[PDB]
Design an enzyme around this catalytic site. Structure first.
Site, PDB file in Angstrom:
ATOM      1  N   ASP A   1       0.731  -1.227   0.010  1.00  0.00           N
ATOM      2  CA  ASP A   1       0.414   0.032  -0.180  1.00  0.00           C
ATOM      3  C   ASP A   1       0.696   1.587   0.084  1.00  0.00           C
ATOM      4  O   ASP A   1       0.662   2.131  -0.945  1.00  0.00           O
ATOM      5  CB  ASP A   1      -1.027  -0.188   1.192  1.00  0.00           C
ATOM      6  N   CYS A  48      -1.637   0.425 -13.332  1.00  0.00           N
ATOM      7  CA  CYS A  48      -1.843   0.191 -12.171  1.00  0.00           C
ATOM      8  C   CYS A  48      -3.238   1.267 -11.583  1.00  0.00           C
ATOM      9  O   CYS A  48      -4.434   1.629 -12.491  1.00  0.00           O
ATOM     10  CB  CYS A  48      -0.582   0.958 -10.657  1.00  0.00           C
ATOM     11  N   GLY A 107      -1.391   4.381 -14.020  1.00  0.00           N
ATOM     12  CA  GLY A 107      -0.658   3.754 -14.867  1.00  0.00           C
ATOM     13  C   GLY A 107       0.382   4.638 -15.150  1.00  0.00           C
ATOM     14  O   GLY A 107       1.369   4.490 -16.271  1.00  0.00           O
ATOM     15  N   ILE A 108       1.381   5.204 -14.434  1.00  0.00           N
ATOM     16  CA  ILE A 108       2.639   6.126 -14.516  1.00  0.00           C
ATOM     17  C   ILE A 108       3.513   5.836 -13.751  1.00  0.00           C
ATOM     18  O   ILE A 108       4.806   5.616 -13.497  1.00  0.00           O
ATOM     19  CB  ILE A 108       2.315   7.479 -14.350  1.00  0.00           C
ATOM     20  N   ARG A 145       4.203   1.996 -11.448  1.00  0.00           N
ATOM     21  CA  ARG A 145       4.535   0.788 -10.832  1.00  0.00           C
ATOM     22  C   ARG A 145       4.555   0.245 -12.493  1.00  0.00           C
ATOM     23  O   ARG A 145       5.388  -0.378 -12.664  1.00  0.00           O
ATOM     24  CB  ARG A 145       3.508   0.053 -10.278  1.00  0.00           C
ATOM     25  N   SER A 146       3.759   1.337 -13.256  1.00  0.00           N
ATOM     26  CA  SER A 146       3.851   0.345 -14.922  1.00  0.00           C
ATOM     27  C   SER A 146       4.727   0.965 -15.174  1.00  0.00           C
ATOM     28  O   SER A 146       5.409   0.428 -16.014  1.00  0.00           O
ATOM     29  CB  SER A 146       2.291   1.195 -14.912  1.00  0.00           C
ATOM     30  N   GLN A 181       7.079   7.874 -10.332  1.00  0.00           N
ATOM     31  CA  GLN A 181       5.858   8.862  -9.641  1.00  0.00           C
ATOM     32  C   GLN A 181       7.076   9.204  -8.457  1.00  0.00           C
ATOM     33  O   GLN A 181       6.697  10.608  -7.829  1.00  0.00           O
ATOM     34  CB  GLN A 181       4.721   8.311  -9.177  1.00  0.00           C
TER      35      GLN A 181
END
Ligand SMILES: COc1ccc(CN)cc1OC
EC number: 3.1.3.48
Length: 281
Positions: free
Chosen positions: A180, A214, A217-218, A220-221, A261
């Site tokens: 998390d 994710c 989409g920036i 973990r992706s 990120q």
């Protein structure tokens, strides 16, 4: 070799500083279509938009917008679609994109609920006998089988085009153990997950590009497709040292804003690539 650069940044604790340089060097391209008011309810976050130049277009003539970007890595001969976790109202669009782009795999790097909030619609069936119909896009989706393991789940889905009666087999790769807060301690399980995806042929040029997401989409992706691309370039090239993770990340950022990120995710990517090489020997 980045291994030395890793220790340097780590011993000096310069990660936040490296990350800020990348932020400042990163491309900025118009995202006019994302900001049209008719598309407000097709975006999960107002600050995460596909660039107009690399956006995936739906082949529905009404409104062709989906929060998705095509990342083309020319040297590595790899392509990826990064997209947001679908919304209740875009699950139909999501599967249409998968159909139209001839994707073989969907990689999911989030749980549906994290920090007691919803990060993503439940866009696939939970039981064999309970298929999902997307009325708006004339697509039927059926769970065929499901293989639960400690760190991830693989599902075999059947996507049927109701208009033409064609069917395709989709693979759903669901990394279920991303914490998390922050990043995994070890990259071991993420690397095993990455190769599992490779072994499936989902990343292979005989198929449309893998869809990766994710919540936004920036983050973990980004880490997924940065590691895959770097490891591939390390086989491809005469000299390994050549491959610079900062250059690869900035090239990927020309296609989608914000990939990676946090400085934590940057450090973790270094660790994954360094460890990932170590399994070539
Ligand atoms: C001949 O095919 C390839 C050669 C090199 C790469 C990567 N640099 C990918 C390929 O795809 C198959």
């Amino acid at each position: 070799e980045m291994e030395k650069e890793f220790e340097q940044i780590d011993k000096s604790g310069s990660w936040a500083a490296i990350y800020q340089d990348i932020r400042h060097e990163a491309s900025d391209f118009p995202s006019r279509v994302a900001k049209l008011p008719k598309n407000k309810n097709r975006n999960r976050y107002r600050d995460v938009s596909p660039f107009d130049h690399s956006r995936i277009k739906l082949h529905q003539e009404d409104n062709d917008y989906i929060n998705a970007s095509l990342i083309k890595m020319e040297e590595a001969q790899r392509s990826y679609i990064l997209t947001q976790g679908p919304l209740p109202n875009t699950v139909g669009h999501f599967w249409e994109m998968v159909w139209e782009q001839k994707s073989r795999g969907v990689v999911m790097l989030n749980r549906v609920m994290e920090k007691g909030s919803l990060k993503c619609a439940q866009y696939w069936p939970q039981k064999e006998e309970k298929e999902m119909i997307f009325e708006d896009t004339n697509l039927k989706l059926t769970l065929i089988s499901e293989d639960i393991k400690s760190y991830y789940t693989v599902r075999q889905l059947e996507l049927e085009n109701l208009t033409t009666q064609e069917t395709r087999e989709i693979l759903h790769f669901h990394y279920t153990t991303w914490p998390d807060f922050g990043v995994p301690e070890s990259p071991a399980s993420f690397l095993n997950f990455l190769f599992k995806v490779r072994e499936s042929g989902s990343l292979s040029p005989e198929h449309g590009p893998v869809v990766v997401h994710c919540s936004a989409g920036i983050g973990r992706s980004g880490t997924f497709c940065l590691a895959d691309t770097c490891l591939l370039l390390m086989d491809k090239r005469k000299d390994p040292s050549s491959v610079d993770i900062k250059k690869v990340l900035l090239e990927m950022r020309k296609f989608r804003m914000g990939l990676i990120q946090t400085a934590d995710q940057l450090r973790f990517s270094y660790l994954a690539v360094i460890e990932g090489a170590k399994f070539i020997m």
